[PDB]
Amino acid sequence: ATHRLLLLGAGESGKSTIVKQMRILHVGEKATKVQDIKNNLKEAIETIVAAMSNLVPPVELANPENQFRVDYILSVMNVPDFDFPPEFYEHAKALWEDEGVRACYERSNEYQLIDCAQYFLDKIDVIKQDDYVPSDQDLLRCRVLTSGIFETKFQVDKVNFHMFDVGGQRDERRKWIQCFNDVTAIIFVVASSSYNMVIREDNQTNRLQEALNLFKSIWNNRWLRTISVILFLNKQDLLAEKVLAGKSKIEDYFPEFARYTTPEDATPEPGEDPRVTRAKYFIRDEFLRISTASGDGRHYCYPHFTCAVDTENIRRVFNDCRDIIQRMHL
Amino acid sequence: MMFHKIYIQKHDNVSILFADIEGFTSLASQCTAQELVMTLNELFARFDKLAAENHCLRIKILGDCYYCVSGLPEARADHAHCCVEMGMDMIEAISLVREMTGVNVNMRVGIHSGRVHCGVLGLRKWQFDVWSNDVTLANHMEAGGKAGRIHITKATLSYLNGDYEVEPGCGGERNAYLKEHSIETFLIL
Amino acid sequence: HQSYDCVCVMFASIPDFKEFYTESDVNKEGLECLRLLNEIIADFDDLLSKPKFSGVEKIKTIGSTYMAATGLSAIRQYMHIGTMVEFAYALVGKLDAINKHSFNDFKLRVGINHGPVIAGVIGAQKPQYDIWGNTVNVASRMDSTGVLDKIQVTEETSLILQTLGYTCTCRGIINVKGKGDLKTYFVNT
Ligand SMILES: CNc1ccccc1C(=O)O[C@H]1[C@@H](O)[C@H](n2cnc3c(=O)[nH]c(N)nc32)O[C@@H]1COP(=O)(O)OP(=O)(O)OP(=O)(O)O
Ligand SMILES: Nc1nc2c(ncn2[C@@H]2O[C@H](COP(=O)(O)OP(=O)(O)OP(O)(O)=S)[C@@H](O)[C@H]2O)c(=O)[nH]1
Ligand SMILES: C=C[C@@]1(C)CC(=O)[C@]2(O)[C@@]3(C)[C@@H](O)CCC(C)(C)[C@@H]3[C@H](O)[C@H](OC(C)=O)[C@@]2(C)O1
Ligand SMILES: [Cl-]
Ligand SMILES: [Mg+2]
Ligand SMILES: [Mn+2]
Ligand SMILES: [Mn+2]
Numbered sequence: 001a002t003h004r005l006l007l008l009g010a011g012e013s014g015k016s017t018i019v020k021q022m023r024i025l026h027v028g029e030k031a032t033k034v035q036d037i038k039n040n041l042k043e044a045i046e047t048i049v050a051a052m053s054n055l056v057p058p059v060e061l062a063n064p065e066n067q068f069r070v071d072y073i074l075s076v077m078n079v080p081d082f083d084f085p086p087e088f089y090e091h092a093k094a095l096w097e098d099e100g101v102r103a104c105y106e107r108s109n110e111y112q113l114i115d116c117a118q119y120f121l122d123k124i125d126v127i128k129q130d131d132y133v134p135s136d137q138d139l140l141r142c143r144v145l146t147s148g149i150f151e152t153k154f155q156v157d158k159v160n161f162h163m164f165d166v167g168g169q170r171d172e173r174r175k176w177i178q179c180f181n182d183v184t185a186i187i188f189v190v191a192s193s194s195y196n197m198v199i200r201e202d203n204q205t206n207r208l209q210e211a212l213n214l215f216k217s218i219w220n221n222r223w224l225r226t227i228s229v230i231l232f233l234n235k236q237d238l239l240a241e242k243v244l245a246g247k248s249k250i251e252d253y254f255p256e257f258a259r260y261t262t263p264e265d266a267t268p269e270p271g272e273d274p275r276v277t278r279a280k281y282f283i284r285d286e287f288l289r290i291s292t293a294s295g296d297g298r299h300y301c302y303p304h305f306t307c308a309v310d311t312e313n314i315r316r317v318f319n320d321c322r323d324i325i326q327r328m329h330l
Numbered sequence: 331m332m333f334h335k336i337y338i339q340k341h342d343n344v345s346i347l348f349a350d351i352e353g354f355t356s357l358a359s360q361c362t363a364q365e366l367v368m369t370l371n372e373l374f375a376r377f378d379k380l381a382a383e384n385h386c387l388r389i390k391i392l393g394d395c396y397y398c399v400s401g402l403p404e405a406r407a408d409h410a411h412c413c414v415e416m417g418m419d420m421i422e423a424i425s426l427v428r429e430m431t432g433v434n435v436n437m438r439v440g441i442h443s444g445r446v447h448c449g450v451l452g453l454r455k456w457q458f459d460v461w462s463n464d465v466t467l468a469n470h471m472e473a474g475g476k477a478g479r480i481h482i483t484k485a486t487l488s489y490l491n492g493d494y495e496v497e498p499g500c501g502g503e504r505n506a507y508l509k510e511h512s513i514e515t516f517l518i519l
Numbered sequence: 520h521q522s523y524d525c526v527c528v529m530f531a532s533i534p535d536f537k538e539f540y541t542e543s544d545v546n547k548e549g550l551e552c553l554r555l556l557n558e559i560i561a562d563f564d565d566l567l568s569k570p571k572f573s574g575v576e577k578i579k580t581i582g583s584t585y586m587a588a589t590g591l592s593a594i595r596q597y598m599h600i601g602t603m604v605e606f607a608y609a610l611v612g613k614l615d616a617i618n619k620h621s622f623n624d625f626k627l628r629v630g631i632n633h634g635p636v637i638a639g640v641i642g643a644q645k646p647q648y649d650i651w652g653n654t655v656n657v658a659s660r661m662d663s664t665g666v667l668d669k670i671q672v673t674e675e676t677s678l679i680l681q682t683l684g685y686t687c688t689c690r691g692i693i694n695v696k697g698k699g700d701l702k703t704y705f706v707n708t
Contacts (some may be wrong), residue, residue, distance in 0.1 A: 149545045164545075173538075178551035179335055179613035222620045223332045334561045336554050355697035358653075363637055364522070367651045371641045378644040391642050392581055393651070430664055434694075452560035454567055455577045457647060461553055468624050 002160040003325050006179050008218055009189030010211050011199060012115065012143070014234045017308035018189065019152050019165050020140055024311050025318070026154040026161075030134050034127075037120065037134060037142050037276050038084050041127060044117035045092050046077050051111040052104045059107075062100040069094050070129055088129040096121045109196045109248065112203070115238075116141040141308045149175055154320060169203050180223045184330055187230045187321075189308075190214055196248040206253060208283075219301070228300040228330070229291070230321055233284055237307045240276045257282050263304030275305040276296050278306055336509055338449035338461075344401025344406035345413035345443045345486060347386070348472030352392035352436035360433055369435070370394065373427050378422060379409070389460055395472070396420075399446070405441055410489035413441045414518065417480040440471025442483040471515065474505025487516055494501055495519040502508035520639020525554055526591055527603035528655055529609050530630040530662040532584035533559070539623070556583065558667065559625075566609045574599055578649060583661070587608060588650060591638055600676070601683045603631055607670050629670035630662025653698070660695050661703060665689050670706040677704040 007015045015326075021160055052059035061067065069091040076082060095101045105118070119141050123268060126132065150165040164179050167190075194207035215231070218224060242248065251257040260282045268277040275289050284303050291301035305312045324330070351357060359368055371395070377396055381388050385406060386398040400412035416440040424437045444464025450456040467483065475481035481499050482490070501515030503506040508515060536556065542549040563585055566572050578586045587606065589599040607629045614627050634654035640646040657673060666673035672680065677687045687704040695701050 034585075150544075151545055170622075174624075177555055177621045177623070178546040181551065181554060217620075217622070226332065333554055333558060336550075336557050338550065338553055338557070340550070359697060363635075363652050367520075367637050367639065367641070369569040370651075371678045374641060378642060382644065388642065388644055390579075390581075391647070391649070420648075445548075446554055447548060451553070451557045451580060452577075454564040455579065457579055457625075462549065466537075 002162055003184040003330070004162040004164065004179075004182065005185055005187055006164045006176075006183045007166065007187050008214075009168050009232075010191065010207065010214055011145075011170075011201075012194075013168055013189040013191045013211065013233075014308040015165055015168055015189050016144070016146050017140060018187070018232070018314065019150075019163055021108075021308060021311055021314040021318075022152060022161075022163060024136060024140075025315055026156055030139065031135065033139060033142060034132060036144055037127060037138060040114060040116050040141075040143055041092070041124070042082065042084075043114060044121055045095060045203055046073050047111070047113050048101060048105050048108065048117070049073050051108075051113075053099070055104065055107060055110055059104040060100055061098055066068050066095055066098050066101075073225055083270075084103060086128070087176060089124050091138040092121075093124040093267075096124070106247070112200050115145050116143050123285055130154050134313070136321070137309070140311070145169070147172060149179065159326075161230045177223075180221075183227060185225065185230055185325065186218060187232060189219060189232050189234055190215070190287070191238075192233045192280060193242055194240075194255055195250055195283070196242070208254070212286060212290065215228045215287055219291055220294055224299070225295075226299050228302065228324075228328070230302045230304065230324070231284075231287055232306045232308075232317070233280065233305050234306045234308050235286070236280060236305050236313075237310070239280055239283075240273070243276050250282070253283075254286075256286075257311060260285075265301075334453065338447055338450065340447050341401060341405070341444065342445040343405065343407075343409060343443075343489070344399055344446055345409045345441055345489065346397070346399045346446070346460065346468035347413040347416055347441045348395065348397045348469050349417070349437050349439050350396075350472055352438050352477040353434065354394040354456055355361055357431075357433055369427060369431050372430065373424060376423050376427065377420060380416060380419040384419060385412040386401065386416045390457055392425065397460075397469075401446075402448070410443055410486055413443075413486070413492070414480065414482070414494060417441060417518070421478065423478070426452075436477050438472055438475040438481070439479065440468060440473065440475040440481045441486045442468035442471050443489050444468075453466040453514070467511075467513075470505055470507040471501065474501040474508045474515070475499075476504075476517055482516055482518060484514045484516070520637065521644065522635060522637045523548070523591065523593070524635050524639075525597065525633055526636040526650065527589040527597075527600045527631065527633040528636065528650070528656065528658040529587050529607060530584060530587075530659045531607060531627050532582070532588075532662055533614070533627055534583075534667075535624050535625050553614065555617075556619060556682055556684045559583075559614065560585070562613045562617060563610050566606065572602070572606055572609065574602055581649075588636070590633070591636075591650070597633075597679050597683075600679055601685070603633075604670065604680065604685070607631065608708075611668065621694040626667035628662050628663050628665045628667055630658045630660065630672075631670055632658035632661055632676050633675045634675075657695060657698065657701075664693055666690075671703050672706060674702050674704060680706065 009015050072091045147167045152163045154161050189210045195205045199205045199210050262278040304317045357514045381398050386400045387402045390397040401409040430437045446460040446462045448460045496516030499515035499517045540549050540552045576588050589603040611627050623631050636650045636652040636654045638650045661671040686707045688707050690703045690705050692700045693703050
């Protein structure tokens with residue numbers, strides 16, 4: 001039997017990261033992906049420095065010396081084919097070391113900054129080696145936007161899976177429709193953590209709210225009245241951290257969180273902070289209200305608290321899915 | 331259940347022939363609106379004959395444009411020569427009803443070979459049609475064609491076993507699409 | 520076949536579709552596109568079965584373009600004219616519905632014009648219904664040169680519409696092949 005799974009979700013929600021996990025789990029090339037990793041590293045640093053002067057209030061370096069490195073990073077910012085000379089890494093790390101720069105990083109929600117920033121910046125010395133080999137984790141972090149539709153094929157216990165990946169950004173959504181017929185199930189991806197961020201498309205639409213409205217669009221779609229949705233509440237790790245950091249409150253972006261108390265059937269993780277539990281579930285329910293209101297038992301919604309970059313958490317919930325595919329005779 | 335049953339079906343290895351009237355407006359600036367519709371009907375009546383002979387399938391008629399396709403209903407390896415011959419017979423066909431018109435009526439044959447997706451769209455007033463890039467391209471041969479000749483693509487020449495004789499149509503310079511798509515056109519001699 | 524003195528012809532196309540058509544292995548070769556079109560058309564056809572559009576006659580569909588006519592159901596006086604217009608708005612209201620569910624942004628282009636037309640059938644093998652005349656391509660050209668979400672109508676057409684309680688803006692001039700330069704107007708909503 002073959003089950004064609006479609007991956008839908010906003011931008012950077014983590015769609016490509018799951019398809020990656022599928023090759024990790026059920027399926028010399030790493031050479032070409034080193035470049036893309038470095039490209040990430042570059043964007044990460046150059047973006048944070050850029051934001052320093054534009055944030056309000058602006059952000060001052062803790063070491064005036066670094067200004068020159070700041071001037072450096074900017075000068076090579078739009079360079080076409082960058083050589084990634086040895087100095088670059090030095091100037092890069094230097095800045096990262098700079099406390100003021102990190103202060104700016106903490107306010108990265110106030111500007112568009114790729115996820116893998118901190119991760120990669122923290123291994124400049126590793127990535128700079130010319131004998132450098134990307135770990136599976138690094139590849140999981142390597143962010144590269146997807147434009148168009150990509151189909152991946154795998155097999156699990158001789159059960160065939162045809163997974164479809166697409167672009168999450170608004171301009172891409174117009175290609176989705178080409179996979180709405182004969183689809184088996186929809187795996188809707190959500191970037192739980194991005195409750196304090198806005199999308200790139202206008203830098204004004206809240207990212208979480210964008211996911212909601214988008215989910216609503218798929219749920220209540222005139223051609224998905226029967227299709228059940230496997231809702232992945234991803235980037236749990238980022239969410240938890242954010243919640244525990246206490247810096248930016250959820251009730252400030254979604255005031256309805258103030259009225260919220262945690263559910264009964266709530267099953268927390270071993271030693272999971274009640275605030276984290278209370279939050280991730282608040283988030284989940286927001287998506288359930290959307291599915292509950294309509295559908296008429298024609299199709300169903302299956303939540304999942306996930307972390308795509310985590311091959312273990314993913315091997316876990318994916319099985320939770322293989323079941324529902326079989327168990328529901330889908 | 332989700333989408334209306336689509337009465338569509340793919341079809342590989344076929345030949346798509348388009349044909350329009352060289353300067354139809356000049357033609358209409360002379361004869362009565364009725365006489366045109368009659369000359370038209372007259373022609374295509376003769377056309378539909380040649381079609382069923384040349385193993386073709388008339389698809390639809392849009393004023394002065396006639397487009398049938400060999401390779402249907404049933405697949406035929408001879409699908410290319412059919413359209414060609416069809417073009418041939420069409421060439422003379424139009425030439426003979428030019429006698430009745432007493433005016434410069436002429437055609438412009440364009441044929442590209444490939445694959446289509448045919449059926450019918452919507453729910454009401456069904457009309458058989460064909461759909462594909464090759465089908466768009468065939469249409470552009472008819473456009474970037476040459477009056478009185480047969481404008482075949484390099485694909486239509488490869489299913490032809492070159493039993494016919496071609497020559498640079500240079501259609502790339504006679505039509506934007508053919509140029510923008512690096513298309514080597516020819517013309518049956 | 521007979522002729523008429525006043526039929527309101529309308530052409531409505533979706534330019535944005537030709538680009539949208541993609542023949543990739545993923546979408547089964549533009550099939551899924553044709554499937555999305557089949558819906559669009561099917562949707563427009565559903566309008567015909569209404570109470571106020573009970574006088575509209577879908578004639579045929581060419582490419583992504585919808586071709587209907589009003590006033591053929593006859594041997595205040597030009598109500599079918601404003602009706603053909605009301606049908607344009609219908610098509611659009613229906614097109615912006617699809618977009619909502621296809622995460623797309625399709626836009627219709629309209630061309631409405633009237634005048635005598637020669638109705639009847641052409642094609643000998645399987646005959647098909649179609650209307651002819653200058654009245655026709657003029658409305659056609661009103662579309663091929665119209666603007667997105669705008670109905671381009673000839674001046675005669677304009678005049679009446681106003682008497683019918685419509686406002687119109689003079690687009691300016693247009694070179695209608697064979698008919699020289701004409702002065703079109705846009706139906707302001
Ligand atoms: C004064 N004109 C006419 C009087 C009686 C019958 C027809 C006409 C007439 O010239 O109609 C045109 C369309 O309505 C009509 N036509 C096109 N498609 C359709 C169609 O789908 N249905 C009907 N009924 N008519 C159509 O055929 C004609 C072709 O228009 P094109 O813009 O395609 O010009 P061309 O084919 O490229 O020739 P040209 O002068 O460069 O060389
Ligand atoms: N911290 C953390 N990062 C994650 C998680 N899931 C994915 N990411 C990171 O998110 C970034 C974007 O992931 P990606 O899979 O490209 O998003 P996408 O939905 O595919 O978005 P697009 O590429 O169509 S615009 C990557 O750097 C990836 O490593 C998670 O659970 N936690
Ligand atoms: C529907 C999609 C697409 C791309 C596919 C195609 O092969 C066409 O339908 C043909 C060429 C093709 O079906 C033969 C008829 C005709 C009338 C010549 C069509 C139009 O030119 C269409 O353009 C329009 C107006 O959509 C076009 C080009 O559109
Ligand atoms: Cl998201
Ligand atoms: Mg992607
Ligand atoms: Mn012509
Ligand atoms: Mn024509």
